[PDB]
């Protein structure tokens, strides 16, 4: 597991989404360097205009690139599931609005680490902060809490993302996540800890398609 991650690894992300019946697809590419907890990716909405704000999809768009200190390496479930991979599911509840349910598979295809996701969004308000596009194109840092889910031979993760609204307020996005290995192979189940994350969003001045450039750093801690 850990070995597949000692250098720079190419990443491919493919998402098929349907939010309140607005269908869309996104392809993303870049690379991850888990030694530094670093990810660099560019995402493109290949179906035209993205019908939701780009920051709402960041969490959905590869925790195996998190930087686990040497003393915590026995708690790295993510890389221990590789290369066969793991299934990652979430329900993301946007306060006072709709919710996303996602199902993704994260695994190696050759030397490329792939995240393939299906996202379904329902109960959004037509002119709410999401379908209405009222969110600032930026992103706050936060802590992602991980706990072992022994029953499933996997983990449960939970955390809150606060999206900045254009009026100065916050749109809370409550995430409930579960991961389970794809193989029948062994994995490492962790003690409780958290991932500290920071994300910067930008635009490629040369790009005419609707898109998002993402630079992220994540380090595990709390042990």
mmCIF file of N, CA and C in Angstrom, residues 125-215:
data_model
loop_
_atom_site.group_PDB
_atom_site.id
_atom_site.type_symbol
_atom_site.label_atom_id
_atom_site.label_comp_id
_atom_site.label_asym_id
_atom_site.label_seq_id
_atom_site.Cartn_x
_atom_site.Cartn_y
_atom_site.Cartn_z
ATOM 1 N N UNK A 125 -33.329 23.459 -3.274
ATOM 2 C CA UNK A 125 -34.255 24.550 -3.549
ATOM 3 C C UNK A 125 -33.836 25.221 -4.855
ATOM 4 N N UNK A 126 -34.777 25.399 -5.793
ATOM 5 C CA UNK A 126 -34.402 26.048 -7.050
ATOM 6 C C UNK A 126 -33.529 27.282 -7.022
ATOM 7 N N UNK A 127 -33.814 28.157 -6.046
ATOM 8 C CA UNK A 127 -33.128 29.433 -5.844
ATOM 9 C C UNK A 127 -32.492 29.445 -4.440
ATOM 10 N N UNK A 128 -31.969 28.306 -4.006
ATOM 11 C CA UNK A 128 -31.249 28.165 -2.716
ATOM 12 C C UNK A 128 -29.780 28.525 -3.032
ATOM 13 N N UNK A 129 -28.910 28.431 -2.046
ATOM 14 C CA UNK A 129 -27.506 28.800 -2.229
ATOM 15 C C UNK A 129 -26.784 27.908 -3.229
ATOM 16 N N UNK A 130 -27.315 26.694 -3.439
ATOM 17 C CA UNK A 130 -26.648 25.707 -4.346
ATOM 18 C C UNK A 130 -27.089 25.844 -5.806
ATOM 19 N N UNK A 131 -28.368 25.549 -6.047
ATOM 20 C CA UNK A 131 -28.865 25.660 -7.429
ATOM 21 C C UNK A 131 -28.803 27.134 -7.794
ATOM 22 N N UNK A 132 -28.921 28.043 -6.803
ATOM 23 C CA UNK A 132 -28.892 29.482 -7.090
ATOM 24 C C UNK A 132 -27.522 30.030 -7.273
ATOM 25 N N UNK A 133 -26.524 29.189 -7.080
ATOM 26 C CA UNK A 133 -25.127 29.670 -7.180
ATOM 27 C C UNK A 133 -24.796 30.875 -6.295
ATOM 28 N N UNK A 134 -24.981 30.777 -4.988
ATOM 29 C CA UNK A 134 -24.697 31.934 -4.139
ATOM 30 C C UNK A 134 -23.457 31.733 -3.298
ATOM 31 N N UNK A 135 -22.629 30.750 -3.640
ATOM 32 C CA UNK A 135 -21.474 30.435 -2.848
ATOM 33 C C UNK A 135 -20.224 31.069 -3.472
ATOM 34 N N UNK A 136 -19.340 31.625 -2.604
ATOM 35 C CA UNK A 136 -18.042 32.214 -2.963
ATOM 36 C C UNK A 136 -17.110 31.083 -3.486
ATOM 37 N N UNK A 137 -16.243 31.436 -4.397
ATOM 38 C CA UNK A 137 -15.399 30.446 -4.999
ATOM 39 C C UNK A 137 -14.131 30.451 -4.116
ATOM 40 N N UNK A 138 -14.228 29.789 -2.971
ATOM 41 C CA UNK A 138 -13.107 29.680 -2.069
ATOM 42 C C UNK A 138 -13.410 28.472 -1.151
ATOM 43 N N UNK A 139 -12.573 28.217 -0.162
ATOM 44 C CA UNK A 139 -12.753 27.030 0.661
ATOM 45 C C UNK A 139 -12.007 27.171 2.001
ATOM 46 N N UNK A 140 -12.638 26.850 3.113
ATOM 47 C CA UNK A 140 -11.975 26.971 4.426
ATOM 48 C C UNK A 140 -11.181 25.701 4.793
ATOM 49 N N UNK A 141 -10.230 25.784 5.707
ATOM 50 C CA UNK A 141 -9.577 24.545 6.187
ATOM 51 C C UNK A 141 -10.521 23.892 7.227
ATOM 52 N N UNK A 142 -10.360 22.598 7.495
ATOM 53 C CA UNK A 142 -11.158 21.938 8.565
ATOM 54 C C UNK A 142 -10.508 20.618 8.937
ATOM 55 N N UNK A 143 -11.114 19.936 9.937
ATOM 56 C CA UNK A 143 -10.597 18.622 10.417
ATOM 57 C C UNK A 143 -11.628 17.612 10.063
ATOM 58 N N UNK A 144 -11.132 16.489 9.532
ATOM 59 C CA UNK A 144 -11.932 15.314 9.067
ATOM 60 C C UNK A 144 -11.726 14.212 10.119
ATOM 61 N N UNK A 145 -12.784 13.826 10.813
ATOM 62 C CA UNK A 145 -12.648 12.852 11.904
ATOM 63 C C UNK A 145 -12.881 11.434 11.479
ATOM 64 N N UNK A 146 -11.911 10.574 11.784
ATOM 65 C CA UNK A 146 -11.982 9.186 11.375
ATOM 66 C C UNK A 146 -12.107 8.232 12.578
ATOM 67 N N UNK A 147 -12.975 7.248 12.452
ATOM 68 C CA UNK A 147 -13.089 6.235 13.490
ATOM 69 C C UNK A 147 -13.176 4.882 12.793
ATOM 70 N N UNK A 148 -12.677 3.853 13.460
ATOM 71 C CA UNK A 148 -12.732 2.514 12.898
ATOM 72 C C UNK A 148 -14.174 2.044 12.915
ATOM 73 N N UNK A 149 -14.561 1.342 11.881
ATOM 74 C CA UNK A 149 -15.867 0.778 11.903
ATOM 75 C C UNK A 149 -15.519 -0.717 11.781
ATOM 76 N N UNK A 150 -15.283 -1.337 12.933
ATOM 77 C CA UNK A 150 -14.875 -2.766 12.968
ATOM 78 C C UNK A 150 -15.836 -3.763 12.320
ATOM 79 N N UNK A 151 -17.135 -3.501 12.512
ATOM 80 C CA UNK A 151 -18.217 -4.319 11.975
ATOM 81 C C UNK A 151 -18.043 -4.496 10.468
ATOM 82 N N UNK A 152 -17.802 -3.384 9.781
ATOM 83 C CA UNK A 152 -17.603 -3.397 8.331
ATOM 84 C C UNK A 152 -16.135 -3.593 7.905
ATOM 85 N N UNK A 153 -15.220 -3.786 8.854
ATOM 86 C CA UNK A 153 -13.836 -3.957 8.461
ATOM 87 C C UNK A 153 -13.478 -2.682 7.651
ATOM 88 N N UNK A 154 -14.033 -1.549 8.069
ATOM 89 C CA UNK A 154 -13.773 -0.296 7.399
ATOM 90 C C UNK A 154 -13.721 0.880 8.394
ATOM 91 N N UNK A 155 -14.008 2.100 7.918
ATOM 92 C CA UNK A 155 -13.966 3.268 8.821
ATOM 93 C C UNK A 155 -15.211 4.081 8.599
ATOM 94 N N UNK A 156 -15.495 4.996 9.523
ATOM 95 C CA UNK A 156 -16.633 5.909 9.456
ATOM 96 C C UNK A 156 -15.946 7.196 9.641
ATOM 97 N N UNK A 157 -16.391 8.186 8.879
ATOM 98 C CA UNK A 157 -15.721 9.485 8.949
ATOM 99 C C UNK A 157 -16.816 10.513 8.972
ATOM 100 N N UNK A 158 -16.595 11.587 9.706
ATOM 101 C CA UNK A 158 -17.638 12.606 9.771
ATOM 102 C C UNK A 158 -16.962 13.964 9.914
ATOM 103 N N UNK A 159 -17.617 14.991 9.406
ATOM 104 C CA UNK A 159 -17.077 16.300 9.501
ATOM 105 C C UNK A 159 -18.058 17.268 8.908
ATOM 106 N N UNK A 160 -17.786 18.556 9.118
ATOM 107 C CA UNK A 160 -18.671 19.632 8.677
ATOM 108 C C UNK A 160 -17.840 20.505 7.791
ATOM 109 N N UNK A 161 -18.419 20.935 6.681
ATOM 110 C CA UNK A 161 -17.723 21.859 5.825
ATOM 111 C C UNK A 161 -18.634 23.080 5.914
ATOM 112 N N UNK A 162 -18.035 24.260 6.023
ATOM 113 C CA UNK A 162 -18.789 25.512 5.982
ATOM 114 C C UNK A 162 -18.410 26.235 4.686
ATOM 115 N N UNK A 163 -19.360 26.370 3.783
ATOM 116 C CA UNK A 163 -19.157 27.092 2.504
ATOM 117 C C UNK A 163 -19.511 28.568 2.705
ATOM 118 N N UNK A 164 -18.689 29.493 2.223
ATOM 119 C CA UNK A 164 -19.003 30.923 2.394
ATOM 120 C C UNK A 164 -20.035 31.380 1.409
ATOM 121 N N UNK A 165 -21.085 32.031 1.907
ATOM 122 C CA UNK A 165 -22.173 32.576 1.031
ATOM 123 C C UNK A 165 -21.767 34.023 0.630
ATOM 124 N N UNK A 166 -22.208 34.441 -0.552
ATOM 125 C CA UNK A 166 -21.831 35.714 -1.090
ATOM 126 C C UNK A 166 -22.263 36.882 -0.215
ATOM 127 N N UNK A 167 -23.284 36.669 0.605
ATOM 128 C CA UNK A 167 -23.701 37.726 1.586
ATOM 129 C C UNK A 167 -22.919 37.786 2.890
ATOM 130 N N UNK A 168 -21.885 36.947 3.110
ATOM 131 C CA UNK A 168 -21.112 36.993 4.357
ATOM 132 C C UNK A 168 -21.495 35.831 5.282
ATOM 133 N N UNK A 169 -22.632 35.164 4.983
ATOM 134 C CA UNK A 169 -23.070 34.048 5.848
ATOM 135 C C UNK A 169 -22.393 32.680 5.472
ATOM 136 N N UNK A 170 -22.815 31.605 6.121
ATOM 137 C CA UNK A 170 -22.255 30.257 5.825
ATOM 138 C C UNK A 170 -23.337 29.213 5.492
ATOM 139 N N UNK A 171 -23.020 28.406 4.511
ATOM 140 C CA UNK A 171 -23.883 27.315 4.133
ATOM 141 C C UNK A 171 -23.156 26.053 4.696
ATOM 142 N N UNK A 172 -23.733 25.427 5.739
ATOM 143 C CA UNK A 172 -23.149 24.213 6.337
ATOM 144 C C UNK A 172 -23.441 22.978 5.440
ATOM 145 N N UNK A 173 -22.441 22.104 5.283
ATOM 146 C CA UNK A 173 -22.574 20.890 4.535
ATOM 147 C C UNK A 173 -22.088 19.783 5.493
ATOM 148 N N UNK A 174 -23.029 19.034 6.035
ATOM 149 C CA UNK A 174 -22.739 17.971 7.031
ATOM 150 C C UNK A 174 -22.465 16.654 6.307
ATOM 151 N N UNK A 175 -21.243 16.110 6.502
ATOM 152 C CA UNK A 175 -20.807 14.922 5.779
ATOM 153 C C UNK A 175 -20.813 13.707 6.677
ATOM 154 N N UNK A 176 -21.428 12.623 6.214
ATOM 155 C CA UNK A 176 -21.362 11.324 6.911
ATOM 156 C C UNK A 176 -20.799 10.391 5.866
ATOM 157 N N UNK A 177 -19.711 9.708 6.190
ATOM 158 C CA UNK A 177 -18.984 8.931 5.190
ATOM 159 C C UNK A 177 -18.644 7.543 5.730
ATOM 160 N N UNK A 178 -18.592 6.561 4.844
ATOM 161 C CA UNK A 178 -18.116 5.249 5.256
ATOM 162 C C UNK A 178 -17.206 4.758 4.130
ATOM 163 N N UNK A 179 -16.153 4.024 4.511
ATOM 164 C CA UNK A 179 -15.257 3.408 3.557
ATOM 165 C C UNK A 179 -15.095 1.934 3.930
ATOM 166 N N UNK A 180 -15.027 1.093 2.906
ATOM 167 C CA UNK A 180 -14.839 -0.314 3.077
ATOM 168 C C UNK A 180 -13.971 -0.766 1.916
ATOM 169 N N UNK A 181 -13.047 -1.682 2.180
ATOM 170 C CA UNK A 181 -12.094 -2.143 1.161
ATOM 171 C C UNK A 181 -12.802 -2.907 0.060
ATOM 172 N N UNK A 182 -12.232 -2.858 -1.138
ATOM 173 C CA UNK A 182 -12.804 -3.592 -2.270
ATOM 174 C C UNK A 182 -12.306 -5.025 -2.137
ATOM 175 N N UNK A 183 -11.034 -5.224 -1.851
ATOM 176 C CA UNK A 183 -10.636 -6.633 -1.748
ATOM 177 C C UNK A 183 -11.284 -7.492 -0.626
ATOM 178 N N UNK A 184 -10.666 -8.624 -0.390
ATOM 179 C CA UNK A 184 -11.027 -9.480 0.709
ATOM 180 C C UNK A 184 -9.694 -9.362 1.495
ATOM 181 N N UNK A 185 -8.722 -8.660 0.909
ATOM 182 C CA UNK A 185 -7.378 -8.447 1.494
ATOM 183 C C UNK A 185 -7.395 -7.693 2.835
ATOM 184 N N UNK A 186 -6.319 -7.815 3.610
ATOM 185 C CA UNK A 186 -6.339 -7.169 4.914
ATOM 186 C C UNK A 186 -6.186 -5.662 4.786
ATOM 187 N N UNK A 187 -6.643 -4.947 5.797
ATOM 188 C CA UNK A 187 -6.492 -3.490 5.850
ATOM 189 C C UNK A 187 -6.113 -3.090 7.258
ATOM 190 N N UNK A 188 -5.702 -1.850 7.478
ATOM 191 C CA UNK A 188 -5.396 -1.403 8.840
ATOM 192 C C UNK A 188 -6.583 -0.642 9.347
ATOM 193 N N UNK A 189 -7.072 -0.977 10.536
ATOM 194 C CA UNK A 189 -8.217 -0.284 11.128
ATOM 195 C C UNK A 189 -7.586 0.697 12.064
ATOM 196 N N UNK A 190 -7.993 1.966 12.020
ATOM 197 C CA UNK A 190 -7.318 2.966 12.883
ATOM 198 C C UNK A 190 -7.856 3.255 14.281
ATOM 199 N N UNK A 191 -7.030 3.851 15.148
ATOM 200 C CA UNK A 191 -7.602 4.375 16.393
ATOM 201 C C UNK A 191 -8.209 5.721 15.884
ATOM 202 N N UNK A 192 -8.967 6.401 16.720
ATOM 203 C CA UNK A 192 -9.559 7.674 16.344
ATOM 204 C C UNK A 192 -8.487 8.684 16.089
ATOM 205 N N UNK A 193 -8.632 9.453 15.025
ATOM 206 C CA UNK A 193 -7.688 10.533 14.703
ATOM 207 C C UNK A 193 -8.401 11.440 13.716
ATOM 208 N N UNK A 194 -7.687 12.424 13.213
ATOM 209 C CA UNK A 194 -8.324 13.306 12.252
ATOM 210 C C UNK A 194 -7.318 13.743 11.171
ATOM 211 N N UNK A 195 -7.860 14.219 10.050
ATOM 212 C CA UNK A 195 -7.011 14.695 8.957
ATOM 213 C C UNK A 195 -7.213 16.195 8.982
ATOM 214 N N UNK A 196 -6.136 16.960 8.905
ATOM 215 C CA UNK A 196 -6.177 18.433 8.883
ATOM 216 C C UNK A 196 -6.047 18.811 7.405
ATOM 217 N N UNK A 197 -7.051 19.500 6.842
ATOM 218 C CA UNK A 197 -6.995 19.795 5.409
ATOM 219 C C UNK A 197 -7.044 21.234 5.051
ATOM 220 N N UNK A 198 -6.377 21.615 3.950
ATOM 221 C CA UNK A 198 -6.485 23.019 3.472
ATOM 222 C C UNK A 198 -6.520 22.928 1.959
ATOM 223 N N UNK A 199 -7.374 23.733 1.354
ATOM 224 C CA UNK A 199 -7.634 23.696 -0.109
ATOM 225 C C UNK A 199 -7.680 25.085 -0.690
ATOM 226 N N UNK A 200 -7.003 25.308 -1.804
ATOM 227 C CA UNK A 200 -7.023 26.596 -2.490
ATOM 228 C C UNK A 200 -7.630 26.345 -3.874
ATOM 229 N N UNK A 201 -8.595 27.166 -4.246
ATOM 230 C CA UNK A 201 -9.274 27.042 -5.565
ATOM 231 C C UNK A 201 -8.793 28.193 -6.458
ATOM 232 N N UNK A 202 -8.572 27.928 -7.735
ATOM 233 C CA UNK A 202 -8.160 28.956 -8.706
ATOM 234 C C UNK A 202 -8.733 28.617 -10.118
ATOM 235 N N UNK A 203 -8.468 29.503 -11.092
ATOM 236 C CA UNK A 203 -8.934 29.295 -12.469
ATOM 237 C C UNK A 203 -7.743 29.253 -13.414
ATOM 238 N N UNK A 204 -7.882 28.557 -14.518
ATOM 239 C CA UNK A 204 -6.768 28.475 -15.491
ATOM 240 C C UNK A 204 -7.220 29.575 -16.490
ATOM 241 N N UNK A 205 -6.487 30.692 -16.537
ATOM 242 C CA UNK A 205 -6.786 31.835 -17.439
ATOM 243 C C UNK A 205 -6.958 31.425 -18.897
ATOM 244 N N UNK A 206 -6.357 30.317 -19.280
ATOM 245 C CA UNK A 206 -6.545 29.863 -20.630
ATOM 246 C C UNK A 206 -7.743 28.988 -20.882
ATOM 247 N N UNK A 207 -8.478 28.706 -19.832
ATOM 248 C CA UNK A 207 -9.533 27.756 -19.977
ATOM 249 C C UNK A 207 -10.957 28.316 -20.241
ATOM 250 N N UNK A 208 -11.624 27.886 -21.304
ATOM 251 C CA UNK A 208 -12.948 28.421 -21.580
ATOM 252 C C UNK A 208 -14.028 27.494 -21.094
ATOM 253 N N UNK A 209 -13.680 26.249 -20.809
ATOM 254 C CA UNK A 209 -14.708 25.314 -20.317
ATOM 255 C C UNK A 209 -14.958 25.699 -18.858
ATOM 256 N N UNK A 210 -16.108 25.340 -18.307
ATOM 257 C CA UNK A 210 -16.337 25.627 -16.834
ATOM 258 C C UNK A 210 -15.383 24.630 -16.077
ATOM 259 N N UNK A 211 -14.609 25.102 -15.112
ATOM 260 C CA UNK A 211 -13.602 24.223 -14.534
ATOM 261 C C UNK A 211 -13.142 24.742 -13.167
ATOM 262 N N UNK A 212 -12.238 23.993 -12.539
ATOM 263 C CA UNK A 212 -11.758 24.342 -11.213
ATOM 264 C C UNK A 212 -10.349 23.792 -11.091
ATOM 265 N N UNK A 213 -9.442 24.614 -10.587
ATOM 266 C CA UNK A 213 -8.062 24.202 -10.311
ATOM 267 C C UNK A 213 -8.006 24.151 -8.786
ATOM 268 N N UNK A 214 -7.501 23.024 -8.276
ATOM 269 C CA UNK A 214 -7.471 22.704 -6.856
ATOM 270 C C UNK A 214 -6.099 22.354 -6.394
ATOM 271 N N UNK A 215 -5.638 23.015 -5.319
ATOM 272 C CA UNK A 215 -4.350 22.675 -4.697
ATOM 273 C C UNK A 215 -4.690 22.351 -3.199
#
